[PDB]
Design a protein around this ligand. Structure first.
Ligand SMILES: NC(=O)[C@H]1CCCN(C(=O)[C@H]2CSc3ccccc32)C1
Ligand SMILES: [Zn+2]
Length: 139
């Protein structure tokens, strides 16, 4: 679990969105596993606007932050699950690091701010849904 709170927006994994997230929907994209909903209170986070490929993510299944080298956002095949049929997930960045399904929502951060959130993983990998291209989050 986990979310990004920026301005009057809450960014979560679309597969983990609540009834409240859907009732206050701003934008969603099943192909990115992303959902953005509106909040009344101002958010704590700021978004990186960069091309960093190194960062630090929070892994709740270890209660630890880990440094990672991650790929550029891309279309990656994701095997079927309870949440989605087998498909290509876009704007996904892969890295070697520990992750378990409950780790989705953990923030990936670089020196510039929030890069994205944990969305995929398994077998020593961790996939992050990029948010750096979502410029409208800052306005
Ligand atoms: N974005 C999706 O389609 C995901 C929906 C939940 C299941 N997905 C996974 O990759 C799991 C497998 S082991 C793991 C480890 C960290 C995170 C997720 C996962 C796919
Ligand atoms: Zn950066």
């Amino acid at each position: 679990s986990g979310a990004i709170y920026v301005g009057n927006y809450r960014v979560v994994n679309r597969h983990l969105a609540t009834h409240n997230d859907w009732a206050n929907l701003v934008w969603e994209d099943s192909s990115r596993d992303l959902l953005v909903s509106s909040t009344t209170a101002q958010g704590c986070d700021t978004i990186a606007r960069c091309d960093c490929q190194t960062g630090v993510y929070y892994c709740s299944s270890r209660r630890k932050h880990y440094p990672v080298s991650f790929s550029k956002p891309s279309l990656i095949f994701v095997e079927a699950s309870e949440y989605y049929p087998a498909r290509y997930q876009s704007h996904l960045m892969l890295a070697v690091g520990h992750s378990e399904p409950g780790d989705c929502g953990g923030i990936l951060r670089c020196q510039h701010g929030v890069v994205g959130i944990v969305s995929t993983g398994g077998n020593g990998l961790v996939g992050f849904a990029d948010v750096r291209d979502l410029l409208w989050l800052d306005e």
